[PDB]
Each structure stands twice: as C-alpha cells, then as structure tokens.
C-alpha cells in the first residue's frame, strides 16, 4: 500500500480533455514572455510549449513548473512532438527563421514557409478547432502563410500585427500629455513596420479629438512634430534591440491581452492583422491591421475606419508590396 | 497655446513623491524576472531599475514601459545613479559577481563585498526606511554582508534563502501525490544549497503527517526514496542552467510572493534567510532559512521549528561553515 | 443601413456557445455575494442568475450588468426559466426556505426538498454535465437531496459543507497567533453545524504540530481553551445574524474559492461535503465534510484523515443523525 | 510557557503606520458594495468602516473578517468613533439623508449639511491629508458641502459624479453595437441626475466618430433614437430600485475603479465632480462632472471638452440651480 494510496482515496479516472488550453510555439525570448504573461493572467488551465531545440524547451518548461506554487495553471507541458499541443483553444506562433547577412526578404519568407509547412499541419492535426495567433516576423506575410497552409477560415487566423505598435503609440501619447495610456486613444493600422499608418483623426482623450484642436496634427508643418511619435513607434523595437539585444516584455504583455479577449470571449476591439481583400480597395489575399472584434471564434467582426485618401493609398501600397512577395512563394 | 494646454487644464503642481516604490538591482535574467512578476501583480506604483551596464539597463526600462497600457504601475525609471531609487519601500538585490575558474568561495564573497560597499550605502542613503531583500548568491552569506554594511536592524534585511527550494519541494511533492502545490505542505530550511534540510516531520496534506503515515520517509530504507525529491530540489538550478543556460521564471515568482507579503503587510510565513544566533545552539552572526512572518517592517517574528538532533546538527554545521567564510571578510 | 452596419463589418454568425458558464440559483444575500465574488475573480465567460421572484431577479441582473465596464465577464443573464442556464459548467444552488415560528426542523427540510424537486430537474435538463455546488441549509442533507434527485455520480455533487467553517477557524487561529490565516492550518470536518469536528492533530503553522507542542490542545483541561475557538466557529453565523440580520460576504468568498478550483481544475484540497459511505464505518448514503481534491470533474479524490476513536465516533453519530432525517424525506 | 511561546519567537516591533488605508463611511448597501469591491481589488492594507449603528457595523466588519482567508487585506476595523479611521489615504462618504414626502430640495440639503458637520470635521481630524470621495446624493451639492466644511483644497475633494452614468452609457452602447464596453467610448457630464449631458461628439469606437457617421445621433430625428440610451442612463438607478429595492453592485464597482486610480496614482481620466468655477461661463462655486485626471493628490488636471452651445447652456443652468440652493445654506 503506497503512501499516496494510504493518504488519498481515488474515486475518478481521467478524461484527457482540458478546457482552456493555450499552446505557445517557439520558446525564444518572445515566446517565453508570451508564456509568463499568460500564466500570470490566469488565462489557461493547461499550457503547452513546443520548439525544435530539446534541452532549451525542457529547461524552460521546468523553470515555469518550479513556479507552480505561485500560479493558477496546474498543467505545464512541453515536447518536440506536437501531440502535446492537443485540444488547444489558442496556439500562439513565435517561431521563425533569423535573417542572414546577404539574404533577401523573399528568401527569408520562403524559409519561414518551409518551417510553417511542418508546424502548421501538426497544429491543425492535434487541435482542429483552435485559433492561430501569429507573432513571427514578418507577421503580415506569415499570417497569410499560416492561413493558406492550415486551410482555416479567416476568422480563426489572426496576426499580432499592429497591436503593440498601437500600445507604444499610446504610451508615447501619454508621456506627452501626462495621462495614462488607458485614457489616451489612437490607432496604428496597416502593415506592421515602417509603412504603418497612424490614424490622426481617431486620436483623442475623453472624446476630445486632437485633430479638431490641432488641425496640423501629424503633418510636416506641425510645430510640435507629432509625426515623430509615430517614427518612434516604428523605430522602437530596433532601438530596444540595439540597447539590450532583443525585445520581449511589451510583446509578451501585448499577446497576453489578445489571448485574454479570445479566451474569455470579451469582444473587445484590437488592432490585429486580418485578411482584408474587399476593403480599402485591396483586391489581393493580404493581411493588414484593422480594429477587430476578438472573441472565442477569433475575429468575429471588424470596424470600418474612415480613412483619408492619403491613408487609404498607404494601405493599398502596403498590400501591393505584400502580394509582390507572397506571389513568389512556393507552397508545393 | 499648445495642444496639451488647450486640452488639459492644470490645477496643481506638487513635488511627486511615490508611495509603494520598489527598486530591483541588477537587470540580469533574475532581476528582470523579479521585475515582470512584480509588475503583473500590481505590487508597486513606481518600479526602479539600477545596474552598471547602461545600454542594457535602458533597453530593459523601455521594453517594460512600452507595455504600460497593459499594466497598472504608472511609472518605470532606471539609471546607474541611485538617485532614481529614492524613497523605495523595498529594494531587491539580484546583482553580484560571477565566480571565475580556480576562484575560491571566499574570494568570490570578497568580490561581492567590494561590490556591496558601493551598492548598499547608496541604497540606504536614498531610501533609509526600506527593506532589503537579497537574492544574489551565495544568498545566506550576502544577507549578512548587506546587513553589516547597511547598519539596518535584522528585521529589515531579508534573504530569499530557501523560499524557492520550498516551493520546488512542494511542486515535486505535488507531482507524486496528484495534488496542487498550494495544498502540499513541506519546508526546506537552513542553508540555501547542498546542505539544506528537508523537514520530513512537517510534511503534510490536509494536516495529515506523511511521516506518521509512512515512518521510513526521507530515510535510506524508504522504498519510495523521498530523499530523491530533496536531491532534485538541491540540483534544480544546476539542471536548469544545463538545459537552458540560466534560471529566471521560478525565482522571479518566488521573489514577487515575498514582495506581496511585505508591501501588503500580510504577515504570511515564508522560509527566508534571517539572523538566527540564539536558535539551535548557534552562537555566531549567521543567516539561515527559518519560517518567518513578513509584513511592512520586514521580519517581525519567526517560527521555532522542532528539529531532530540530526537535522539540528546540519543547521549547526552549516552555521559553522557560513561563519568560517564570514569571519575572513574585510569591510574596512 | 444602420449605424452598427456602417461601423462594423460582420464576418460570421454565432455565438450562443459559452465555454465557462456558471449559474447561480437564488438571489438572496448569499447568492449575490457568490455572484459578485465570482465576477471579480474572472472565473466565468457567462453568468446566469435564477430565482422565483422576477422583479428581484431582473433588478440584480441589471445592477451587475451596469458594472460591466469594470468586469471581464461579457454576458450576464437571468430569468425564471431555466433555459437561461443551458450548458453551465458549474451550478451553485443558494435557494432555500427559512424556518417559521413553531415549525419543526423536519418540516423545514421537507420544504427545502420540495423546492429542490423543482430546481434540480430543471438544472439537469439544461446542463446535464455540470458540477453541482449546494450551499443551501441544511447543506449536508440538501447535498444528499440534490444527489438523489439529479441522478449524478457523487463526484459531480459537492456541498459547501465545512469549507467556510474551516476558513473561520483559521481566521481565529490567526488572530490568536499573530499570523495570516493563509499560514495557519486547521480543518473542521464532519457535519456543518453543532456536531462538526475540529481535527486538533492536524493543526499547525509552518509544519509544526500544535498538538505536539501543546498535548492538552482542545481537551477540557486546556489552560488556553482552544475548544472555544471551535465554539466561536460554530456560532459565528448566528452572531453575525444577530448583529446585521443575515450573512453574506464570507460565504460568498468561500464559494468563489471552490468555483476557482473547479473552473480552473487546480486540484486543491478543500473541506467540502461529499458522499462517504465506506469511510469511517458508515454504511449509509450520507454527506459530510472531509478534505477533497477539487477540479473540473468535481471531487476526484479525497484525503483519508486519520481520526482518533472519539473523532470517528462523532462522524458516525452525525451520519446516524443525518440518515434518520433523510429516510423520512418524500421525493414523490 | 504557552503554545504561542513555544511556536513563535518574537522580534522587537517597530511602529506600524498604515500605508494604504481606506475608510468607507456608511454601511448601507452602497457602502458595503464599495468595501467588498475595494477588498477584492487589493487596493488597501487596512479598511475602516464607520456608521452610527453599532450592531450593524460590527456585524458587517465580522462578516468581512470571516473571509480573510480569501483576501489579501490583513486588517479590517470598524467603529462609531472616527479614531478607527486614523491615517486614511482615501475616505469614501456614502452616508446621507433620505428625502421625506413633501420636503423641499433646500431642506433636504440642509439636513445633509448638519450631518456632514459631524462627519467631515471628524474625518479630517483623524486623517488630515486624505482625499475625500463623496458618493452621497445629491452628489454634486454634497461635494460642495464636504469641500467648504473640510477646509480642503479642491484637488482633494472628489464627487463620484457622472462616473457610473458614463459606465452605464457604455454598457448600453455596447449592447447595441455588439462590442464590449471597454472598447465603447462616450462621456456623460455635468450634473449627476436628470440634467446630465451625453456628449454625442465624443462617442466613438476605435477612434471613429458615431456622430460623423450618423449625423442625426442624439436628436429627435434619429431613427435609432440614441437619446433613449441616455434617458435609460438617467432612469437606471430609479428602475433598479423598483425592481430590487435599492442599488449597490454597479456603484460599488464604480467607486472601486476611482479608488484604483487614486491609490495607485494611475492618472486615468474619469468623469467625476469637481469645482469648475472658470469653465463654461460658470462664475460660481459649484461642482460638476468633467473628465478629470485622478492620482495620488486626487484631481490634478481636467480635460477641456468642447461642448455645443446647447451642452454648455445645460451645464450653465445646472450651475445656476446648484448655486441657488448652496447660497441659502448655513454652516
């Protein structure tokens, strides 16, 4: 009669099935920041981690597990085999290839295509009703890639896109004004990167339009140079990488917030990357960021922002660029 | 007028003085893990980071700042200058020397003393009412050093000690029993390291003594080899360092839990490192792990755990070893 | 086109499928304290309230709904019809009669049986795979009642039992000792009420047995009169009723703690009422409180607490008391 | 030696001053909702309850204490004497009179003044550097009263004002749009009650103006009648009362939300009642709801909303009406 059995009378067995499982693919600094942030917000009853480097994956799992006493997520698992990700509600993809010195953007994407041809089908096999959240750079293109390979409908394939960008924009907006970012409002949309669009018309505090107060807001002739705030948004990851050698915390928190709306079915609006053939004159299968309603079925609806002609043309240019790359990919 | 002044009307300007400020020293993986956990538990209204590497320091500051929208800690600052740490309630020390090849234990502690002769007087100058929480290894020795240099009474000088060891033990106790660590009770006391004491007699679930149920517990003749659970605890950091290159997550959560009790004055019992000359026939100024009651003035009380004479001799031997090194240290 | 259609582009149909729904039956002070506590711990994506009094019911629902901005629970429903409770993971029953002047105890219980015969079948029709958590007095009898009427296996029918008793006990233990209740351990087992059993042997702080330190603990000869603490626990609800007219806050927090373990599958050990035919020589279908591992399938395991002969005889006496009442209850 | 002697070894104790203490005055349903939400949001290291009814007060304290296991607020105290409130950072006032059948507005407010003449000096005696948060109806006037009696600067005297009204508005807005209220934005301002003002201009989701998209928004000629959402806001509390007898849960969460911003110095923007002699043609000492930045020194700043002529005038009319009552009061 073992100690366990002298102590505990069993009366039930298992079923396997967990109810609120999240999987994070890739356990680099981004993936692990996604993981700790999700764990501390009690978003899941099971957390699976997956990556190709066995020792690192096991050490990260172990390290999280050793903190279980301080957490409310009772099952943390890992492995190279995707069997461990089974029945996940949300699967967050952070794994990707690192760009080499003399390598084209297109080649870097092709190498990510090849990687995703392993990852994505293994994900769908083991969790056919899950939402995909793609964080991997370049996120807009890799969301398309995940979409084509998975064969999921568009509402269940989401890219992190311009979500953190918008948060950064609001942080900075808050620093200028002396107000918490929760109470500053502003949207960065379109291509996550240099060609993202800061929507000046929507920027406000307490419903007071900044543009109405300051018509030259976000133009060259702006005495206060608010276009710099957006430049800072675009060059913020690069500036952090220079300083500490990578980014993690903001993106981790950012992703955990997206997971929160999905898992809890909150129907909050977030700027995330979605397939938007139809809108703003775009006619190719391309993912850009737009304010989306996020819930248990992924992106259920999206908000139609009125954009000026200039802004509209920025989204159109970004889509041509994205399609320019996507059309040279090889899936078969 | 500016856009800020047209928007916001200022009512008053008073010198901004923070009320629940916490500083973390060292922005290595350990330090940043402590920081992120504290931020996500909302334990402070101001978080300050300090370290000697400026690029890295600033990078970590900015990465956190950038996620402010997702947090409720309004102000994050950093600097190599300790003026940024002014009026901190709790100051957590994670910084220290990394042992060189062929270097003695003593000489490693000495280099940590030279470092603390810089750090500690700067911490006390700028917030003299704070509590010190030492995390850097060797933690029991470095709590002494922190205590001797600060001039602080012992209650305000705390070492993370066996806090995480105990949590690891509970995790592992949990995986054997099939029960969450919250409901598995057991204490690892003494010196944080190879010489720690797993207090078999106190191990329980729902108040039922595992020792009483299974008298061979933690003895060589135990057919379930519960002694290995302790071995796993002692070798956990090593095994994790080997797998993934460092440790961060569990320790960070460990330290935020202590911080919670302190900042909220909860008076929970935590196994942390404290001055115990007087107990277990110990006659020197040595810090070891005993259950302590933590609150807003640090350690207010400690629990007198009853030890077998064998367990008692292990604390004693550890005490002698710690004093052996401590008495060979130079402060002036 | 409406303003909704001009603002929002709908991508798909749904939902009507809630993943973590909790129903609360009864909107007295108890049911609503349970409701608010659950809302502030973010345990559910949907909350349903049911009661027989429509105005009270609509009012409570509204009042909660008006707070939605400060919550993370997006759907709050109520109604007299149990169709609003479809697909609930957990159903918490707080409805029940109060004793009238000159009414016998048997008659009171029978009336509670009579309302359960309306409530339980309606709960099981609409959520046949839910866990049931009975809070209504007398809780041990009515947990039997819900069990027999529902048809559910014993694992999915749970009484709140001595859960709050145990929490009150630890509160007072904490006041006496100068320690937070989180670090004081003690279990009150058996029949919720006058005949409940404070397990002296299991009481400890930091794994140190109080019984071993103080062997007269909880005897008649005890110079410190610890038995009075148990008296206070048993009479605490009565004292609060005298002072303010009813009880709510403590029970509400206590019920939300159990919900947490169920919803999040934590496998924490709680002292809750369960069917213990087979244990302690009891051969009757009776429910009383013993420590139980709680999770997504209700009670999966229980801790065999080692009781002295006296302690065991008391549980056997309660079982006999309980069964003698139950056998006189009409279910047809 | 006692049990305690053998278990616990005690160290020199230093002075415990509470660092995050919040007092709630009035243990009606409103006060108690305020308390429980504050407790479940870990905003305080000490919670004080005060009221004139000793039994009810003690029982409410006890009931919260019995839940200490599931909380992280280690000291909960109560008493009739305001010494139990010493060193509060925030003091939340919920007590106040109930208007009687046939009683004028002036007479009701006068009775509140006499009650506040007992409560306010006592509260400032024991916590002189606190922020006062006034929840008691009529809130705008009673915030004035609390201000003049306390001797406090305007930044430390706060009225819950239109905070909950706006929160209600967003919920109802969310129900129509199928969006969570966190992502619906709109402000209700001015006098808390029938005369409050829904700023249609500021209503947006994701920065897109509803007004711009639907120009007849708010007006009589609106096919969707968005004016009924504000009528619904104005009449909600009244309606909840008919149904259940009283209001508590929503207001409790509303007050905890402001406590959050105050206790943690968040500098979030909340529609609360503040003294706005200076804006909107208002030349009198009156408190109305305006979007205010809340932090550790209370109201540090406010947002200057651009109102329509109609919106401004309604604020101006409320100001006049409030001063007309306040000018007849005797302190």
Swiss-Prot record, chain D:
NAD(+) binds at residues 28-56, 98, 137. The modification Phosphothreonine is found at residues 17, 308, 321. Gene3D superfamilies: Lactate dehydrogenase/glycoside hydrolase, family 4, C-terminal, NAD(P)-binding Rossmann-like Domain. The modification Phosphoserine is found at residue 309. It holds the Pfam family Ldh_1_N. The modification Phosphotyrosine is found at residues 9, 238. It is linked to Glycogen storage disease 11: A metabolic disorder that results in exertional myoglobinuria, pain, cramps and easy fatigue. PANTHER family: L-2-HYDROXYCARBOXYLATE DEHYDROGENASE (NAD(P)(+)), L-LACTATE DEHYDROGENASE A CHAIN. Interconverts simultaneously and stereospecifically pyruvate and lactate with concomitant interconversion of NADH and NAD(+). This is L-lactate dehydrogenase A chain. It comes from Homo sapiens. The gene is LDHA.
